[PDB]
Write a protein that binds this DNA or RNA. Structure first.
Ligand SMILES: [Mg+2]
Ligand SMILES: [Mg+2]
Ligand SMILES: [Mg+2]
Ligand SMILES: [Mg+2]
Ligand SMILES: [Mg+2]
Length: 1312
RNA sequence: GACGCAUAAAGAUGAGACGCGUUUUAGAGCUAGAAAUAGCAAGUUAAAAUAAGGCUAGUCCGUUAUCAACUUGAAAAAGUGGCACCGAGUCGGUGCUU
DNA sequence: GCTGACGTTTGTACTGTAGCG
DNA sequence: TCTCATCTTTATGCG
DNA sequence: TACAGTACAAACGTCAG
């Protein structure tokens, strides 16, 4: 009667296996529905459900924010048009209509075809006078004439459309900073108190050297105008009031409280951004762009003359062929400037007079475009200065730009603050803003319509956890003083001490804990036990010596926020006071909640009577982040109604009982537990309601559906035991501590081994090293990874994190794939690894970092990947590590959901009866089981290995449970300790083996029949149970099912493709015919439908009846589902039989002659649908012939298994016979099978390892799913893609229940 | 014998932005030709769109998640498939039983 | 007369190709 | 790619 | 890995003798 279930859950699979108490997998004669003659089927209850992995929300969000940016950009353009509109209608009743109809063709345009001036002649005298937008911008700035509104609009609209980044706080301005005479003002100012630096690469290393060549009064002065100095101590040689000085990031008023800094800092930074002020202008960016254009002009004039006078045969390939990455491909084709440079540098090396061009290419100046990937370095304030200059000229002639100058000034610089979010009116699930009035939001009225404070508080409050114990209560800040006290008293209530006189160790009394906290947790940020035993036990308790226990040599707990508030609020008795504790809690809550200084000031204003303004100025810089696991109500709001204390009171003092948070909230004697359990629907609603990524919701829901379907199979009786394989681990304590070493020590060891003084120049703390940019800065020893340039620790936003292998090629967000680099160097390696030249020029420095172990060997391999520079689809053959985290999350959730679904009956004696015992095995047990008794696992043959893992999980779990029911609490849900646990869980499996072998060669014979002790019952018969599991491993029928999935997402490929007279292009906008305008291509089919209809066919048209697949794209899907028959008639189908329309999602399964199966991948592609049931002997041979020298066993055990391969050399040929018979049966790639046979015969003499480690690849020919390329040694086999779908229209369609047990089979031959 | 403390790795969710890129159009091509084009000149920029679109019309929403088939149902949701044994190349046979 | 010659006029294999920092 | 914020899982140390 | 670009092979009229 009884049965059990095993589950193996992966990112793309769940394996499931019902087992009997005998460890046999059962089978039933299942009824099958549908029109076919077949009425019942024999099926084993072992299988695997296969589904494609769920996508994370990343791509959808990166499209959503882009959609918002384009909407807002067009609205900026519209407010500009609104200001310009009554005036533009004077000079041009249709200019905005012409910029709008710019995209259309000449006869589609209602107005004359030239966008800006309309007429041809003025549009060309225009482009002759101003060849780009920047000659326009410059002429507008430096000249003082009355100028054309249509061109003001274009200059402003261009700057408003492409406005540059906002990563610089406040503003830069050129007008205070154009002229290098500021050093005279600086020395004149210090007496009250060229390009000399900038001619070389900017860092302190050059700046000090130059100024000493030209103590403190010059260089130490000027760095405070130029650099974010590292010491926190006060300055020297300084003003009459003495404090620290640096060019601080957010607010230089934090340093001025000790003008020329603004002038000189803007001058140096703008002259670092722009190669300007060797010439005097008022429009520096436009001047630089015009200099680029003129240099490009003279360079091309030189270049073509050189090419014609020395290599005239070469010209067309460079300058006309737009496919070659020549200049034609650089301009008219798709080539970048890197591709053009590597194209053109060999040609320049052999010509004469090219030295200047070769010099310019090495600086990246050679024939630059004006708009490039590195324009993301340009801040918006430069554009802001140009727009201000423009308006300040024109206002003398345009009264209306005088009247509303600041509205246009507002429109470019307005950015929605990130804490406010999308400006909805209630219908956006992403919106959290609250608006004061129902008025429409503009950049001008934004401050009076939107309540920024409430929205900014709600921004955090929507995201921070509810307390897991009190789900209606939001958690504390991490740094809240209540949480500090909670943490220290939670830790210190459980430490124990003993002296020479005492019989046994004793807890700290409440007096002692209070004394320790006030003594040293309030006078040291982190306390060592050395500090505890000296400063408390030796100094207060006067002990000669003491042993302390319950804590490592450094305490985990801290009162660091007390130290902060003590440095700020000077009255220590204020911080130790009871009355003001709520106010201090509000201060730290605000200071965690808000980072914008104005709302910090506006929130803290209510307490300005308790502290001075100097303290308040100190409080508003003390930014905090992070939130505790617990709510205020939990830790000090609720009281046990019998005793009267809160949790924090108990942690402060609990007599000698000294309970911590756990034993408190689990003691029935304290009504905390009653408060918890009174503070504490369908499957799909529950699965939607969980937190975390949407990606994991797929694998959880499908396996819960699988388990419920299995329960439906077994007469609605529940299983005794459910075994879930967990992606969980045990380690030795030394390995696990090494696996989690503090990341400061990683830096210190490597820096000491390479011997640099960077930590003397830039000291840093492990709390600070949690920042990703800063961690990378120290890992790289202060230098860029792509040019030999000293990085700046203050400017780490203009440096950016390159992913060494790009995310578009491979998802890898690890430190081994991250590089901090200058933004231009990162964006100059779009979709690639670093180039060959950069590997050649820096492989030595990378080797110095590798030898010093700041980078891994994997990181060195990714950096030097151009030495192996494939980046092919065949290089994907290692798992992305995201699949492990998803597996862990899914299996963790499914444990608690299946426990909640199975064990539902509450009881008053004990709370919940285990009707079903849900089990969560770590994978090491099943892995050791597989490797000990030669039940090996090869992932490349076929998909049955998922079901075999579930079978072995159920077998091993039930065997361990029935062998050790005393050890039920180690598996059922609800030298170092870790090393002892690791050896215990290693040795717990010894009951499966007949012999136990010691390291000295001793052997112990174990019984052939295993039993438990406490009831003597048989569990593991090493005679017949191993034979039984070997029988179940050799079944040829396993219910593999691929989930039928309607596709969602992008309508097409994203690339927009040029116009052509082909009807397959997707119309990219409703009125834009793609024969004229181009459009998208590669559409994605949501599902096929089987259509049966007439069609008008033949050159003399006549109705022919037809049955075929129609691929409903995602775009057209809703129109189809509104009303099918008119959609089919629009597609051209006539007399359609409505009831015979069959919906066919992706991977709809069909079966054909000789057992052949095909999965419908679209209306015009199939996929191979059968699975090779290869016998176990050849599988274990393939695993042992693979892995041949790298087996983990002893040399004797390696040898005997390596000989097992040699004993079965003839297995190689019979595997090829197996693959031939199968491929002929199901795959039908006869040319590929002949190529496979011929290549095999080409290499039948090569080593049996290399043969097997390539026969393992031939199963790509046979394996289920999409045809994919594979290779056998040198020979590469191209995929035999099943682009024909003609056959499935008369196959039998198989609709599979989610396990694959029940079926509906439709014989489509009878349909038509 | 699943929880908050410290550490670390790998990931995730949301907001605000930047740079590109593509597409069509605009930037008069010229000269020589029966010619298809060839020589030569040119090129660097801009507008518009950037999922088709949608109705609550917002400076909002539109690529995540949910889906075998069939009977009920607006949908949520509920419902629908005998067992034992001997065998095994993707499931077969045998016997009870409804 | 009526088999087949000779174009047009559709229907099948093979290589490319895909938004990204 | 940037800025800002929050959160999950797993592993080790202390209860 | 599904579809796109595109080089390649059967089928369907009017001549052709
Ligand atoms: Mg597994
Ligand atoms: Mg999806
Ligand atoms: Mg990059
Ligand atoms: Mg698996
Ligand atoms: Mg721990």
């Amino acid at each position: 009667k009884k049965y059990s279930i095993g589950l193996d859950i992966g990112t793309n699979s769940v394996g499931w296996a019902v087992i009997t108490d005998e460890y046999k997998v059962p089978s039933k004669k299942f009824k099958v529905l549908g029109n076919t003659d077949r009425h019942s089927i024999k099926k084993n209850l072992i299988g695997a459900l296969l589904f494609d992995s769920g996508e994370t929300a990343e791509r959808t969000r990166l499209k959503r924010t882009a959609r918002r940016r384009y909407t807002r950009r067009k609205n900026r353009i519209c407010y500009l048009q609104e200001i310009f509109s009554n005036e533009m209608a004077k000079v041009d009743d249709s200019f905005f209509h012409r910029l709008e109809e710019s995209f259309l063709v000449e006869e589609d345009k209602k107005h004359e075809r030239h966008p800006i001036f309309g007429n041809i002649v003025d549009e060309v005298a225009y482009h002759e006078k101003y060849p780009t937008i920047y000659h326009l911008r410059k002429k507008l700035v430096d000249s003082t004439d009355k100028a054309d509104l249509r061109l003001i609009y274009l200059a402003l609209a261009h700057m408003i459309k492409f406005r540059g980044h906002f990563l610089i706080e406040g503003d830069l301005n050129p007008d205070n900073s154009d002229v290098d005479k500021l050093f005279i003002q600086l020395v004149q100012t210090y007496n009250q108190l060229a390009k000399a630096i900038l001619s070389a690469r900017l860092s302190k290393s050059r700046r000090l050297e130059n100024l000493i060549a030209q103590k403190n009064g010059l260089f130490g002065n000027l760095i405070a105008l130029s650099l974010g100095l590292t010491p926190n101590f006060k300055s020297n040689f300084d003003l009459a009031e003495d404090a620290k000085l640096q060019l601080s990031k957010d607010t230089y008023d934090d340093d001025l409280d000790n003008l020329a800094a603004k002038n000189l800092s803007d001058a140096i930074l703008l002259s670092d951004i722009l190669r300007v002020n060797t010439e005097i202008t008022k429009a520096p960016l436009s001047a630089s762009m015009i200099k680029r254009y003129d240099e490009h002009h003279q360079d091309l004039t030189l270049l073509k003359a050189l090419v014609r006078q020395q290599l005239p045969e070469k010209y067309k390939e460079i300058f006309f062929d737009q496919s070659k990455n020549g200049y034609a491909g650089y301009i008219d084709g798709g080539a970048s400037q890197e591709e053009f440079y590597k194209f053109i540098k060999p040609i320049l090396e052999k010509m004469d007079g090219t030295e200047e061009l070769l010099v310019k290419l090495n600086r990246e100046d050679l024939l630059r475009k004006q708009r490039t990937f590195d324009n993301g370095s340009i801040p918006h304030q430069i554009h802001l200065g140009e727009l201000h200059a423009i308006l300040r000229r024109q206002e003398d002639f345009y009264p209306f730009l005088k009247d509303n100058r600041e509205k246009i000034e507002k429109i470019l610089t307005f950015r929605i603050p990130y804490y406010v979010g999308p400006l909805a009116r209630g219908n956006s699930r992403f919106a959290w803003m609250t608006r004061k009035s129902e008025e429409t939001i503009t950049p001008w009225n934004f401050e009076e319509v939107v309540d920024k404070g409430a929205s900014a508080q709600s921004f955090i409050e929507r995201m921070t956890n509810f307390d897991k114990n009190l789900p209606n209560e939001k958690v504390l800040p991490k740094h809240s003083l209540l949480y500090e006290y909670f943490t220290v008293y939670n830790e210190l209530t459980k430490v124990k001490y003993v002296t020479e006189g005492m019989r046994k160790p004793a807890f700290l009394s409440g007096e002692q804990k209070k004394a320790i906290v006030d003594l040293l947790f309030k006078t040291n940020r982190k306390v060592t036990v050395k500090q505890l035993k000296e400063d408390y036990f030796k100094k207060i308790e006067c002990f000669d010596s003491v042993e302390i226990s319950g804590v490592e040599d450094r305490f985990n707990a801290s009162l660091g926020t007390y130290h902060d508030l003590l440095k700020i609020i000077k009255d220590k008795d204020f911080l130790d006071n009871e009355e003001n504790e709520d106010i201090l809690e509000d201060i730290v809550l605000t200071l965690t909640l808000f980072e914008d200084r104005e709302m910090i000031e506006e929130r803290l204003k209510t307490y300005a009577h308790l502290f001075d303004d100097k303290v308040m100025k100190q409080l508003k810089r003390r930014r905090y982040t992070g939130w505790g696991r617990l709510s205020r109500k939990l830790i000090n709001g609720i009281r046990d109604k019998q005793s009267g204390k809160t949790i924090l009171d108990f942690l402060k003092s609990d007599g000698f009982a000294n309970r911590n948070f756990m034993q408190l909230i689990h003691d029935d004697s304290l009504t905390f537990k009653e408060d918890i359990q009174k503070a504490q629907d369908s499957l799909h609603e529950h699965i939607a309601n969980l937190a975390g990524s949407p990606a994991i919701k797929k694998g959880i829901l499908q396996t819960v559906k699988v388990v419920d379907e299995l329960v439906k199979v077994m007469g609605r009786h529940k299983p005794e035991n459910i075994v879930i394989e967990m992606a969980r681990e045990n380690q030795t304590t030394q390995k696990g501590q090494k696996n989690s070493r503090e990341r400061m020590k990683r830096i210190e060891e490597g820096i000491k081994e390479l011997g640099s003084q960077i930590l003397k120049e830039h000291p840093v703390e492990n709390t600070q090293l949690q920042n990703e940019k800063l961690y990378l800065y120290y890992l790289q020893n202060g230098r860029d990874m792509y040019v030999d340039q000293e990085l700046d620790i203050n400017r780490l936003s203009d440096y950016d994190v390159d992913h060494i292998v790009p995310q578009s090629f491979l998802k890898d967000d690890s430190i081994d794939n991250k590089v901090l680099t200058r933004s231009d160097k990162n964006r100059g390696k779009s979709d690639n690894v670093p180039s060959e030249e950069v590997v050649k020029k820096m492989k030595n420095y990378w080797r110095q970092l590798l030898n010093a172990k700041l980078i891994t060997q994997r990181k060195f391999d990714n950096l030097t990947k151009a030495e192996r520079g494939g980046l092919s689809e065949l290089d994907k053959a290692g798992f992305i590590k995201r699949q492990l985290v998803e597996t862990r999350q899914i299996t963790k959730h499914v444990a608690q959901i299946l426990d909640s679904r199975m064990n539902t009956k509450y009881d008053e004696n004990d709370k919940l009866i285990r009707e079903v015992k849900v089990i969560t095995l770590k994978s090491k047990l099943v892995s050791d089981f597989r490797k000990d008794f030669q039940f090996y696992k090869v992932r490349e043959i076929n998909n049955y290995h998922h079901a075999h893992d579930a079978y072995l999980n159920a077998v091993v779990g039930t065997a361990l449970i029935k062998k050790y029911p005393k050890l039920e609490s180690e598996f059922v849900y609800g030298i170092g300790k870790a090393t002892a646990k690791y050896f215990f869980y290693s040795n717990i499996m010894n009951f499966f083996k007949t012999e136990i072998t010691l390291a000295n060669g001793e052997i112990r014979k174990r019984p052939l029949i295993e039993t438990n002790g406490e009831t003597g019952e048989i569990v593991w018969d090493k005679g017949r149970d191993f034979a039984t599991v070997r029988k179940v491993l050799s079944m040829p029928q396993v219910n593999i099912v691929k989930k039928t999935e309607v596709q969602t997402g992008g309508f097409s490929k994203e690339s927009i493709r040029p116009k052509r007279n082909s009807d397959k292009l997707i119309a990219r906008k409703k009125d834009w015919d793609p024969k004229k305008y181009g459009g998208f291509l590669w559409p994605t089919v949501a599902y096929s439908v089987l259509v049966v209809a007439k069609v008008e066919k033949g050159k003399s048209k006549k109705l022919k009846s037809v049955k075929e697949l129609l691929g409903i794209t995602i775009m057209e899907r809703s129109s189809f589902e509104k009303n099918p028959i008119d959609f089919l008639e629009a597609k051209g189908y006539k007399e359609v039989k409505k009831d015979l329309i069959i919906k066919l999602p992706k991977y709809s399964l069909f079966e054909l002659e000789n057992g052949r199966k095909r999965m419908l991948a679209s209306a015009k592609q199939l996929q191979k649908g059968n699975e090779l049931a290869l016998p176990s002997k050849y599988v274990n041979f393939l695993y042992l012939a693979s892995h041949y020298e790298k087996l983990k066993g002893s040399p004797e055990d390696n040898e005997q298994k390596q000989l097992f391969v040699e004993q079965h050399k003839h297995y190689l040929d019979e595997i090829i016979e197996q693959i031939s018979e199968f491929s002929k049966r199901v795959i039908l790639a006869d040319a590929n099978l002949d190529k496979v046979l011929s290549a095999y015969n080409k290499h039948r003499d090569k080593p049996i390892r290399e043969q097997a480690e390539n026969i393992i690849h031939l199963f790509t020919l046979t394996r289920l799913g999409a045809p994919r390329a594979f290779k056998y040694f040198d020979t590469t086999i191209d995929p035999k893609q099943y682009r024909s779908t003609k056959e499935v229209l008369d196959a039998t369609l198989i609709h599979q229940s989610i396990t694959g047990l029940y079926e509906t089979r439709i014989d489509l031959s009878q349909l038509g």
